[PDB]
Design a protein around this ligand. Structure first.
Ligand code: QRY
Ligand code: CL
Ligand code: CL
Length: 317
């Protein structure tokens, strides 16, 4: 292969995740399984500027910063089936480091999560996604991020997160499974002493004695900005946090004393400037354009190829 998944530029994140997976796979000793290559394909710096009315209430009065500088990263899992690569799992993340003011100091928030259900074998499918996610929650806990945040949100019909045109027979999870599927992922992270504990947003906030909306983390296109702005008031937020708690996790990686003695986070990985994988829209555009689909396996093997072709010559700029 001239343009293969492996032959993409490596990173310390990319190598850390693909290790834990092949480590997990090799011990399972299923003969159908194959090599999983994990790559970071976009890393850049960004901010999430506070919205007009939250701004007016707290930013203008001095009590809150006007924006929060995070690093965005896009990363993809590729299996080798029939001796050809298959992009099976993508993930977009916001990383708010130590130099970020509160209340985004040392937090990761997963922008987006997606899959194409042709990972082999299909019994290890869900298991492998869990490794990639615990592997990311482990990686960042070691760099020294205290808290992770997940919006447990299933996709809508007629719209896709990352991959254009999913398999017709790959069913979307109903809210209650997706919640159980994350709880499934986390309870395993807890047993490996990676996660200290996790809580729904309401319980976390009930136990952190939050008395102001400026204390609630403020992520890019997360639910809670839109709620606070549509609210324009602490009660209103305790109503909404309570009603929706089950969808919004707070994953504590570093706890108690060890959280206050932290040296500053230093991401060792360099920035990967990539036009295509800057947010979800530009990649969905290219796939729509060039008639690409992840509908069938052979179609998905086609698409990963034309995805990599485009990636290797946009890096070469
Ligand atoms: N709870 S579960 O055990 O069923 C399960 C299994 C695997 C996964 C891994 C991620 N999978 C995607 C996903 O399927 C889809 C995204 N866009 C779609 C459009 C049409 C049909 C499907 C998709 C996904 C699903 C939910 C939320 C984000 C991304 C997740 C959950
Ligand atoms: Cl998601
Ligand atoms: Cl983005």
């Amino acid at each position: 292969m001239k343009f293969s998944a492996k032959r993409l530029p490596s990173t310390r994140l990319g190598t850390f995740l693909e290790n834990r997976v092949n480590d997990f796979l090799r011990r399972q000793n299923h003969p159908e399984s194959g090599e999983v290559t994990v790559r970071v394909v976009h890393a850049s710096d960004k901010t999430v500027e506070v919205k007009p009315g939250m701004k007016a209430r707290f930013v203008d009065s001095g009590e809150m910063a006007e924006s929060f500088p995070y690093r965005t990263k896009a990363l993809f899992a590729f299996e080798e089936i029939d001796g050809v690569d298959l992009c099976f799992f993508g993930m977009h993340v916001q990383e708010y480091g130590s130099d970020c003011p509160p209340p985004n100091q040392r937090r990761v928030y997963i922008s987006y999560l997606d899959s194409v259900h042709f990972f082999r074998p299909k019994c290890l499918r869900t298991a492998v996604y869990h490794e990639i996610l615990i592997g990311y929650l482990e990686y960042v806990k070691k760099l020294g991020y205290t808290t992770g945040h997940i919006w447990a949100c299933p996709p809508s019909e007629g719209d896709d997160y990352i991959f254009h045109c999913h398999p017709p027979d790959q069913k979307i999870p109903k809210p209650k499974r997706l919640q159980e599927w994350y709880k499934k992922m986390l309870d395993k992270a807890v047993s490996e002493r990676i996660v200290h504990d996790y809580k729904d947003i309401f319980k976390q906030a009930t136990e952190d004695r939050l008395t102001s909306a400026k204390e609630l983390p403020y992520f890019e296109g997360d639910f809670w900005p839109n709620v606070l702005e549509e609210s324009i008031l602490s009660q209103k937020l305790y109503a909404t946090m309570e009603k929706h708690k089950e969808v919004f996790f707070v994953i504590r990686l570093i706890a108690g004393p060890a959280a206050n003695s932290l040296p500053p986070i230093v991401d060792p990985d360099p920035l990967i400037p990539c036009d295509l994988m800057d947010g979800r829209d530009a990649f969905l555009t290219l796939a729509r354009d060039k008639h690409l689909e992840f509908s069938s396996l052979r179609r998905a093997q086609w698409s990963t190829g034309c995805m990599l072709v485009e990636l290797h010559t946009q890096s070469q700029d």
